[PDB]
Amino acid sequence: SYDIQAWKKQCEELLNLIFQCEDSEPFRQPVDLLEYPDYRDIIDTPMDFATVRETLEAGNYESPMELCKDVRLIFSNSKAYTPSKRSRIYSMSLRLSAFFEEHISSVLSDYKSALRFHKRN
Numbered sequence: 001s002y003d004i005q006a007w008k009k010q011c012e013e014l015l016n017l018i019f020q021c022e023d024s025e026p027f028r029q030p031v032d033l034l035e036y037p038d039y040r041d042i043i044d045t046p047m048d049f050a051t052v053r054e055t056l057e058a059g060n061y062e063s064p065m066e067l068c069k070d071v072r073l074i075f076s077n078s079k080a081y082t083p084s085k086r087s088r089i090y091s092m093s094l095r096l097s098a099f100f101e102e103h104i105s106s107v108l109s110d111y112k113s114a115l116r117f118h119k120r121n
C-alpha cells in the first residue's frame with residue numbers, strides 16, 4: 001500500500017468523522033474572547049478543527065505528521081486552558097483525542113512506509 005498521496009483523503013474522512021462527534025463541537029471554530037476573556041494570556045497559539053480542515057484543503061500540509069501536530073495542539077490547548085481536570089469541555093477533549101489517536105496511527109504508518117518504499121533504491 002505504497003501511495004505517497006493517500007494520507008490526504010484519509011485525513012479528510014477522519015475530519016468528517018470528528019465533525020459528526022458531539023464531543024468536537026467546542027473545538028470546531030476558533031475560541032471567542034468575550035466569553036473566555038483570559039484565553040490569550042494562557043494560550044500562545046490557538047487551533048481548531050475548521051482551521052485544520054482549511055489548511056488541508058488549501059494544500060498547506062506536506063505530510064500527515066504536520067496535520068497531527070496541529071490536532072494535538074487543539075488538545076494541549078484544552079488541557080492548558082482548563083481550570084479543572086474534571087471540566088466538561090476538557091473531558092470532551094480527552095475522549096476526542098483517544099478517538100483521533102486510534103484512527104491516525106494507520107494513516108501515519110502507511111505514509112511513512114510509502115516514503116521508505118519510494119527511497120528503497
Ligand SMILES: O=C(NC1CC1)N1CCN(C(=O)c2ccco2)CC1
Nearest residue numbers: 026029030031078081082087089090
Ligand atoms: O469557547 C470554546 N469553543 C467554542 C467556539 C467553539 N472553547 C473551547 C476551547 N476551550 C477549552 O478547551 C476549555 C477547557 C476548559 C474550558 O474550556 C475554551 C472554550
